[PDB]
Amino acid sequence: MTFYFGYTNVELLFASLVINTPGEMVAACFGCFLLAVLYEGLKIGREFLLRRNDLEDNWETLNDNLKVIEAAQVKDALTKMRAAALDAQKATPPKSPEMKDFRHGFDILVGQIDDALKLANEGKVKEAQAAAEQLKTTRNAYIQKYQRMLSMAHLLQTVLHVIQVVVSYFLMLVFMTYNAYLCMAVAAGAGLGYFLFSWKKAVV
Amino acid sequence: MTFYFGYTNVELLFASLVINTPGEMVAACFGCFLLAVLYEGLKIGREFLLRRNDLEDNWETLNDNLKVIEAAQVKDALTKMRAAALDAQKATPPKSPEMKDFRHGFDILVGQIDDALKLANEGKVKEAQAAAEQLKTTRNAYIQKYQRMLSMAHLLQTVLHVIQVVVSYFLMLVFMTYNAYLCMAVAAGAGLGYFLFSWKKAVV
Amino acid sequence: MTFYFGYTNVELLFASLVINTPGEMVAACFGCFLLAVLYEGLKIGREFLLRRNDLEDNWETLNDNLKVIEAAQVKDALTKMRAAALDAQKATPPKSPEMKDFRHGFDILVGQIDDALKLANEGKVKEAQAAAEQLKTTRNAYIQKYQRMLSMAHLLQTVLHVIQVVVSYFLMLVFMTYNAYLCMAVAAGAGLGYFLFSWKKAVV
Ligand SMILES: [Cu+]
Ligand SMILES: [Cu+]
Ligand SMILES: [Zn+2]
Ligand SMILES: [Zn+2]
Ligand SMILES: [Zn+2]
């Protein structure tokens, strides 16, 4: 009835899936386990991508500091824009020709900020302001369109949430079979699966 | 038995709710769908409020920097207090007479910090310290009580969690009916619902 | 059938657990309630520990700033290293001889940073760089091994997730009994339990 140990006449979610041998059970126990791993991974992997979209700040840091720059506080705003520009260049879409355009455009943005700071370190106020307004040519030229990376990520992350919700429900259904070999298979899968993909984000 | 497609003799959570026509099914499928949307919204909307309580930092930033100020490092602590004071003024309770008192009090706090920095930019140490101690009159006068905004938010967010837990369980029960029209209705609702309220926080 | 109020012939997860008296029901209702409290606590308590591992930044802030220091920008990097060193010393493993070694080692790290800033405030460039390289003796001597605190925490947090997943599933099973006294017991437990452990992190 209610937390049995068995391998006989156990239906599994779909009408075609039924198990009457122990060899069929290990198949079901390996699948339910892998679903439990895939799940806790899915959840982490989905967050990792969400935290990577950092860029949303970097991008708005550059554009908020330019609006702040447009009165010798400019050099500090530009220091904030320099750090933002570097972590932004590291970025890459989720797994090379467009990327080489995007990354090579960011090389300039650093140098242009160094020059407008080289004026501002000497004492030059209005000349760095005009040099800052030349950055708006460059960021528009290369980076502003490749915003595509951002949209692609949210859509990918919607699609992941969808699947994450189904897979959750599926693991509830298998747990509701009340079959301790399956229930354990899931629980142990959730236990280990989390550990492995936890170890992988710590590597990154 | 087990992932059927049907509209005949399907009970739905409560003894009174049973469906024997396809027209009753779409009613059940629209409700289960809307519950799936309302849910993924509830979750996001509940986090949005939690992240808005920022203020808990702004407030403790002001009060930690005053304790830091009470030796020409004061002007920097006051710069941190200026930024804190502005984002704090933007704030508003979850959906005007008390707000106009709260926001108009914050106008002073900015000006008072500008004056105690206008002393500290000229070189005046002990005079800015005494001007800083005049801020403790103002923040107590207007802002310190309206702390109410904070308590109202956590209580609202408790009440949301409560409902969020029930609604979760209800969606599990409907999924457990094993009726593919309902199961899909939920899953598709979770899929889309997330997308819409995801799009709404990106607007904010 | 389907959201009944009853205390007669209600099995509860395990074959041995069955209830036929109202006195047995309150026992089941108190246990299901406490499981609902323990749960929402478990979730919060598990996050609290995760957010405490701050240290992972403090540690990498010190080691990234030393690499940055190895040209009178060093004094600022050292200011960042000073703040990092203090919040790092506060830290403690989850509930005294090793701790007294760890905390007393951090006293030096602050003083050593103050001295290498006392050189850098006077104008001395290369002397503070060599004084910074003396910090690498001290952090290795005491703090770098006690990294143990970090590993102990992730392993503890794996073990918590495991139990958190089981307890979730168990609360689903009791809710699936469709017995309104149990269902309420859980829901009310989740409602209150969250409030109490929410109140406890706000105390910390
Ligand atoms: Cu169920
Ligand atoms: Cu569930
Ligand atoms: Zn998990
Ligand atoms: Zn979700
Ligand atoms: Zn919760």
TrEMBL record, chains A, B, C:
<protein>
    <recommendedName>
        <fullName>Copper transport protein</fullName>
    </recommendedName>
</protein>
<dbReference type="GO" id="GO:0031902">
    <property type="term" value="C:late endosome membrane"/>
</dbReference>
<dbReference type="GO" id="GO:0016324">
    <property type="term" value="C:apical plasma membrane"/>
</dbReference>
<feature type="binding site">
    <location>
        <position position="161"/>
    </location>
    <ligand>
        <name>Zn(2+)</name>
    </ligand>
</feature>
<keyword id="KW-0187">Copper transport</keyword>
<keyword id="KW-0558">Oxidation</keyword>
<feature type="transmembrane region" description="Helical">
    <location>
        <begin position="178"/>
        <end position="197"/>
    </location>
</feature>
<dbReference type="GO" id="GO:0031901">
    <property type="term" value="C:early endosome membrane"/>
</dbReference>
<keyword id="KW-0472">Membrane</keyword>
<comment type="function">
    <text>Mobilizes copper(1+) out of the endosomal compartment, making copper(1+) available for export out of the cells.</text>
</comment>
<keyword id="KW-0186">Copper</keyword>
<keyword id="KW-0406">Ion transport</keyword>
<dbReference type="GO" id="GO:0016323">
    <property type="term" value="C:basolateral plasma membrane"/>
</dbReference>
<comment type="similarity">
    <text>Belongs to the copper transporter (Ctr) (TC 1.A.56) family. SLC31A subfamily.</text>
</comment>
<dbReference type="GO" id="GO:0046872">
    <property type="term" value="F:metal ion binding"/>
</dbReference>
<keyword id="KW-1003">Cell membrane</keyword>
<dbReference type="GO" id="GO:0005375">
    <property type="term" value="F:copper ion transmembrane transporter activity"/>
</dbReference>
<keyword id="KW-0813">Transport</keyword>
<keyword id="KW-0862">Zinc</keyword>
<keyword id="KW-0967">Endosome</keyword>
<keyword id="KW-0597">Phosphoprotein</keyword>
<keyword id="KW-1133">Transmembrane helix</keyword>
<feature type="binding site">
    <location>
        <position position="176"/>
    </location>
    <ligand>
        <name>Cu(+)</name>
    </ligand>
</feature>
<feature type="transmembrane region" description="Helical">
    <location>
        <begin position="152"/>
        <end position="172"/>
    </location>
</feature>
<dbReference type="GO" id="GO:0055038">
    <property type="term" value="C:recycling endosome membrane"/>
</dbReference>
<keyword id="KW-1015">Disulfide bond</keyword>
<feature type="transmembrane region" description="Helical">
    <location>
        <begin position="25"/>
        <end position="42"/>
    </location>
</feature>
<keyword id="KW-0479">Metal-binding</keyword>
<keyword id="KW-0812">Transmembrane</keyword>
<feature type="binding site">
    <location>
        <position position="40"/>
    </location>
    <ligand>
        <name>Zn(2+)</name>
    </ligand>
</feature>
